Amino acid sequence: TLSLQLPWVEKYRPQVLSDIVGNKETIDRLQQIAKDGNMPHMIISGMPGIGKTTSVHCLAHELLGRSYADGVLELNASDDRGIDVVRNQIKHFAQKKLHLPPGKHKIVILDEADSMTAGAQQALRRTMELYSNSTRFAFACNQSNKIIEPLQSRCAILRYSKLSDEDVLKRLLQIIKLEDVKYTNDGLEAIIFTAEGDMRQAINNLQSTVAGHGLVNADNVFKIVDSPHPLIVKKMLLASNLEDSIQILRTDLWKKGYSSIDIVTTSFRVTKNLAQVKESVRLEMIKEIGLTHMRILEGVGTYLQLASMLAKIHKLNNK
Amino acid sequence: SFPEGKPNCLLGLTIVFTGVLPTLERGASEALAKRYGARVTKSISSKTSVVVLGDEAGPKKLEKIKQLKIKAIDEEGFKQLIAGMPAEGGEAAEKARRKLEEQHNIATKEAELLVKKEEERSKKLAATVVREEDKLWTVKYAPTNLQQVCGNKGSVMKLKNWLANWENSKKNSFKHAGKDGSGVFRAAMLYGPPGIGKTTAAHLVAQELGYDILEQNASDVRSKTLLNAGVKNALDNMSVVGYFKHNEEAQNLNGKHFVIIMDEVDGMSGGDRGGVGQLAQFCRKTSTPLILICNERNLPKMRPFDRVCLDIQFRRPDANSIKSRLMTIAIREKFKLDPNVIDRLIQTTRGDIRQVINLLSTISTTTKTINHENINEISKAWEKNIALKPFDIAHKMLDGQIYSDIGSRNFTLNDKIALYFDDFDFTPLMIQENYLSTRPSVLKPGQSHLEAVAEAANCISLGDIVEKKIRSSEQLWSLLPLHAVLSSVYPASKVAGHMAGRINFTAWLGQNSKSAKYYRLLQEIHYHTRLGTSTDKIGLRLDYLPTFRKRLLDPFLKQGADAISSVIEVMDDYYLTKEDWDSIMEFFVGPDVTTAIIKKIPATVKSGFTRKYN
Amino acid sequence: MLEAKFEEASLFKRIIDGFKDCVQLVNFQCKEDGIIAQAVDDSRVLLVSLEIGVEAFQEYRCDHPVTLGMDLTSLSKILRCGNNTDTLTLIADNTPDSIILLFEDTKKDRIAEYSLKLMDIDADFLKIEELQYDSTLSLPSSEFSKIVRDLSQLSDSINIMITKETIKFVADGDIGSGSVIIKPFVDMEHPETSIKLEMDQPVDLTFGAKYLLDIIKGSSLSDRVGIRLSSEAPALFQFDLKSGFLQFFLAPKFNDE
DNA sequence: GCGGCATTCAAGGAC
DNA sequence: TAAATACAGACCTAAGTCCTTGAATGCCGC
DNA sequence: CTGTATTTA
Numbered sequence A: 001t002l003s004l005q006l007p008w009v010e011k012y013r014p015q016v017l018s019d020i021v022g023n024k025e026t027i028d029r030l031q032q033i034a035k036d037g038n039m040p041h042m043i044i045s046g047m048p049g050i051g052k053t054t055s056v057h058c059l060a061h062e063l064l065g066r067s068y069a070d071g072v073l074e075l076n077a078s079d080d081r082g083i084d085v086v087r088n089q090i091k092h093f094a095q096k097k098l099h100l101p102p103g104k105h106k107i108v109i110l111d112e113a114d115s116m117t118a119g120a121q122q123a124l125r126r127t128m129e130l131y132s133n134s135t136r137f138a139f140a141c142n143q144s145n146k147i148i149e150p151l152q153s154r155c156a157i158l159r160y161s162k163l164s165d166e167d168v169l170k171r172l173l174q175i176i177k178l179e180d181v182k183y184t185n186d187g188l189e190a191i192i193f194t195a196e197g198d199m200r201q202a203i204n205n206l207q208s209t210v211a212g213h214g215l216v217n218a219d220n221v222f223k224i225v226d227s228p229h230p231l232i233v234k235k236m237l238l239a240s241n242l243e244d245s246i247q248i249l250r251t252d253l254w255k256k257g258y259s260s261i262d263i264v265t266t267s268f269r270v271t272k273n274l275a276q277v278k279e280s281v282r283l284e285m286i287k288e289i290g291l292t293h294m295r296i297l298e299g300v301g302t303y304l305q306l307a308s309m310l311a312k313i314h315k316l317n318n319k
Numbered sequence B: 001s002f003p004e005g006k007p008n009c010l011l012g013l014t015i016v017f018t019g020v021l022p023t024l025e026r027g028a029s030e031a032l033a034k035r036y037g038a039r040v041t042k043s044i045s046s047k048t049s050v051v052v053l054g055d056e057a058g059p060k061k062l063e064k065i066k067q068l069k070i071k072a073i074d075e076e077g078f079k080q081l082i083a084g085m086p087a088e089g090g091e092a093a094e095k096a097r098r099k100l101e102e103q104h105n106i107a108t109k110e111a112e113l114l115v116k117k118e119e120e121r122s123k124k125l126a127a128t129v130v131r132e133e134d135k136l137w138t139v140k141y142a143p144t145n146l147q148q149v150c151g152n153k154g155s156v157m158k159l160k161n162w163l164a165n166w167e168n169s170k171k172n173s174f175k176h177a178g179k180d181g182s183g184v185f186r187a188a189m190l191y192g193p194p195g196i197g198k199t200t201a202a203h204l205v206a207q208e209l210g211y212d213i214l215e216q217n218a219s220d221v222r223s224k225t226l227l228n229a230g231v232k233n234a235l236d237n238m239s240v241v242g243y244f245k246h247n248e249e250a251q252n253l254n255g256k257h258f259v260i261i262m263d264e265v266d267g268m269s270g271g272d273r274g275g276v277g278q279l280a281q282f283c284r285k286t287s288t289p290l291i292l293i294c295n296e297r298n299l300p301k302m303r304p305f306d307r308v309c310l311d312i313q314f315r316r317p318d319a320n321s322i323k324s325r326l327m328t329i330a331i332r333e334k335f336k337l338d339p340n341v342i343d344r345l346i347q348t349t350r351g352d353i354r355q356v357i358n359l360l361s362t363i364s365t366t367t368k369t370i371n372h373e374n375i376n377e378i379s380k381a382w383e384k385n386i387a388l389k390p391f392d393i394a395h396k397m398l399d400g401q402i403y404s405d406i407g408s409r410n411f412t413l414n415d416k417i418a419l420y421f422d423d424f425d426f427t428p429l430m431i432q433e434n435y436l437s438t439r440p441s442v443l444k445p446g447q448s449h450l451e452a453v454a455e456a457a458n459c460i461s462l463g464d465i466v467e468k469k470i471r472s473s474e475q476l477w478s479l480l481p482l483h484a485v486l487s488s489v490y491p492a493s494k495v496a497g498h499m500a501g502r503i504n505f506t507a508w509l510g511q512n513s514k515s516a517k518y519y520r521l522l523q524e525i526h527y528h529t530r531l532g533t534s535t536d537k538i539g540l541r542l543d544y545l546p547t548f549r550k551r552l553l554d555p556f557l558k559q560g561a562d563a564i565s566s567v568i569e570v571m572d573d574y575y576l577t578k579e580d581w582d583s584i585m586e587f588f589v590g591p592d593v594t595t596a597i598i599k600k601i602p603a604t605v606k607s608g609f610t611r612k613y614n
Numbered sequence C: 001m002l003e004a005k006f007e008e009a010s011l012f013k014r015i016i017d018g019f020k021d022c023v024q025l026v027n028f029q030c031k032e033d034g035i036i037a038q039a040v041d042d043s044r045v046l047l048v049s050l051e052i053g054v055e056a057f058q059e060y061r062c063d064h065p066v067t068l069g070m071d072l073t074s075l076s077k078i079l080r081c082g083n084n085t086d087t088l089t090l091i092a093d094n095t096p097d098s099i100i101l102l103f104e105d106t107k108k109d110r111i112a113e114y115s116l117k118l119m120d121i122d123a124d125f126l127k128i129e130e131l132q133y134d135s136t137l138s139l140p141s142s143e144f145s146k147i148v149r150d151l152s153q154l155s156d157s158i159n160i161m162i163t164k165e166t167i168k169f170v171a172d173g174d175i176g177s178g179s180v181i182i183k184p185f186v187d188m189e190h191p192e193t194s195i196k197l198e199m200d201q202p203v204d205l206t207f208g209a210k211y212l213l214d215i216i217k218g219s220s221l222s223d224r225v226g227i228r229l230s231s232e233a234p235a236l237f238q239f240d241l242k243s244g245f246l247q248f249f250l251a252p253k254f255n256d257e
Numbered sequence D: 001g002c003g004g005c006a007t008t009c010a011a012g013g014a015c
Numbered sequence E: 001t002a003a004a005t006a007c008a009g010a011c012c013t014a015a016g017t018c019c020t021t022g023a024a025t026g027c028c029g030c
Numbered sequence F: 001c002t003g004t005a006t007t008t009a
């Protein structure tokens, strides 16, 4: 081997706002903003792999044309979160003179904006206030709560949601058409099912399946990509008899190499997000799983503790 | 399923929704009520016209309705009221029509004003260069004068008077406070939620009163050395731009002074090394007006400013004031907007006018008209996700409706854990403080309040054990979700219901500080007396003190002022001191509390004992 | 288009060094007469003015009065690269977005072309009206710089007292105080170190020590300093050039009671 | 003898 | 004088490391 | 929540 080829995430990364299959309303708003100009300050939030960084990148490209090189300051906020960075480099770029078309502005992209420190986040407010007529800020984060309220006060807020199955399927079919890949409907359904609304993860799984087996079929997908781990745990707690829950814990989880701490964390998360049972039952189950987790975190993590967890949950469900 | 009523058919009516309505959610019902112009208030008052009665409605709601004799209406009654009422409201209806006409007239007036300013600017440009559409609606429509500021008129007037009488108070060395109470403090703090106009009002009053503006972002420059370099040298020097710009005509004699505007005061650092204390000391000695603007006032880092300067609270602007401004910016940007949604716009933004303007600018690019039809997706995608204060966290966590089946379906357990995680340092403390002071509404059949409180306290003990295991060695921080449910969610669920009295702040911090101070005092006493006691700290506290009180204090009560020598000898035998003697009497409780016993002792005996100690 | 050729780049290097620690952003206005630059301090307490005439350049070119918004830190970084024996050429094209600095060696053919991005400085053009002062003197820059450096170690406030043809520099700090008394004298064989003073009214002003240090940091463009006092006007601290000057307008303290 | 920069460390915050 | 609503009560300490960040220490360059 | 400050009735 001498070299590798570009991954389908990067090779088929959209370069225009039309190629994005995300939320139609916000994408159309971004297209209209790019067509008209006067882009306002914004923060885009959502879950990983739904088209947040790509959307802002294509928006900046379409807005600035050939002036992207000298009009876009793209920094990973987690990479550069120091208050000194905002004080010196961001400030100098904001005051920098640049002759631009009468509807376009310099764009500051702050990727992973949720990781910025408090000092830089507070220092950015006056920087974005005094140079708001020639410098525009677009934050890309996963949690809006990590950004201070005054920072959110001066900008538009774009909450991206999980991609629907139809959009992911359409993008996947477009990729297969552009790559000439042998596929099966069951394989694409499995890819979507294990994607859980993350387009990047779906694309990566599809590319890995093609490179490893060649045929996108459900059997191959489940062989190379395991089924979502929380679903087995959810089936495990919701068992009617203790024997079945013990069997799932033994075979699907313990004999497959899943660590005890992972199992207890997944059970905690599933019971937190569970909706089939009542509130009191859920809180009592979380109590028992938390006690077992406390036992595991001391290094007592074995199969006996998880067996006791399931037995005590089944006692709780036994009225 | 709801019939299309005539426009503004509910105009002029005050509607309060009570109970749970099985067809429409309470929020959806409120939005639909505001859709036809009905005024929605959360509390039943004498001005309420119609109250919509639902299931499980609070009993004191019903008592208030009974005393006020206000008509109670069910879901079919609301159906008929929507269907049959004539358009535009058909004695409150004419009053609200006059109000709406006044708002529309004011909107048109300031629209003509704005287009006239644009025409004047174009004429000036022709006579002689940022393009208008390149500016945000926030900066293009920023208030150019105090008369365009909406809401907080009282605070603006107070700040204006404080700034105007600043020189008069300085001439008297800030001794005369005056009727307004402003003039003794040389510095002014402005605190409130972001985006209400505190900085705008401060700049407006600074420029209107002739004071030369000096602005420095506290968060941008947060250092003691930087503060000394840029402010100390600026505290008592005149301005160059103030002299060079204009000094010949008689405008004002205070144009060579400085008004120092420090924004983002809460953004500095804390502790002694932080500039917050330096600026607090600056607020004590200065020859120029000092105006500070902050978003969060009551903070541990912001403690020094609590009493030093004069505080001004800018609150959430009223909807009525904001309606005129949004109407003006709507007619000027030619996008249609009815006022019936403005209230619902204010309610979801939590009174942040900058964010409302930003939302209007961002959304009008695609939807040239915004109506009651799409308002749900507008509000749902622009909700203010801010961390609630610990008091609101305690109020929400102890709400009996939340743990009901409908509440559980709506406000899921994940939302409960997020509410705990909004402030995880105080939520368990508040929950433990005020969980046994709520009247329950989720008691199981055959369970009393005492049983529920006992189970809640048991879960509190488990949560405290988890918290100790977390905040100790091995840093078991991944157990934080567990501490979410054991300390707060489960105990609140056990005793959920209505709030009987008031939500008291957790007293455990104060008792902890008092216990630590008493323990330090006992440590000093024990290490002073170790030469004779040869007993541990707790052993000296429990047993030695009931005898030490009798050896020291009782002779003063039973013998007068001739027992000073014996007490002095006893205290010198154990190397006891005056401060130690004062601290000894503060340890006893119950039937033996010396807080009044020492006052009963004649002052002559105390003076003689102090002289003997000296 | 503009193409201005200096004699030595070190001259502009010292010019930029003189007023780089007081202001950060400067508008350089270029006209057929030369270059003028006025900048207000971030505290709006010290104004910096600079004039460089057409006779201070080896070659000068200007087709229209042009404004250049420059950051002094970046300018110092660019000019630090040059040496003492290079010719410096400032070049600006139509629609100025950047300024080119050419360093050309006279003994070799090596050329160093640097680019500096301009800044948008929304500052108003004010007029520095000249009015007769009450006291105007000239004394060596080195001596004044030494007095400021010694007196700044006690306090941040410096009292200037010109009375009875005596100059008094007073620094009253937390630990003691410091007073310097100077009597003007005319020394024949070198007038360079002489003190030429004209006093009409005795003036009592007070200034900031930090601004004084920032002003004396430019004690490399001349031998003496033209120091002009006024009781109701900011003082003028001037360093003369071969064809221009560097003035500091320093606003005094409040002379309460 | 300063001038400048780099390195280190202590104070606060977060989980 | 009442409606009508905002909205404020209050800020903890030991602990473990990591992170930032101001400021002092330290050295080299001139 | 109670209690108080502010705005409008």
Ligand SMILES: Nc1ncnc2c1ncn2[C@@H]1O[C@H](COP(=O)(O)OP(=O)(O)OP(O)(O)=S)[C@@H](O)[C@H]1O
Binding pocket: A150, A153, B137, B138, B139, B141, B142, B143, B148, B149, B150, B151, B193, B194, B195, B196, B197, B198, B199, B200, B201, B264, B293, B294, B295, B317, B325, B353, B354, B357
């Ligand atoms: N009362 C008001 N009336 C009209 N416009 C307002 C009002 N308050 C704020 N705005 C708008 O909001 C913009 C910014 O207001 P600011 O005063 O900067 O907000 P703020 O209250 O200072 O909060 P910060 O900056 O986060 S501390 C102004 O330029 C106006 O366009």
Ligand SMILES: Nc1ncnc2c1ncn2[C@@H]1O[C@H](COP(=O)(O)OP(=O)(O)O)[C@@H](O)[C@H]1O
Binding pocket: A008, A009, A010, A012, A013, A014, A019, A020, A021, A022, A023, A047, A048, A049, A050, A051, A052, A053, A054, A055, A171, A199, A200, A203
């Ligand atoms: N809506 C979408 N349409 C098309 N491709 C998408 C979409 N969302 C994500 N992707 C793919 O995911 C890759 C990177 O996603 P990215 O936008 O960085 O995720 P995030 O939104 O978490 O930043 C891109 O190469 C792109 O091809």
Ligand SMILES: [Mg+2]
Binding pocket: A052, A053, A111, A112, A140
């Ligand atoms: Mg990304």
Ligand SMILES: [Mg+2]
Binding pocket: B198, B199, B200, B263, B264, B293
């Ligand atoms: Mg502000």
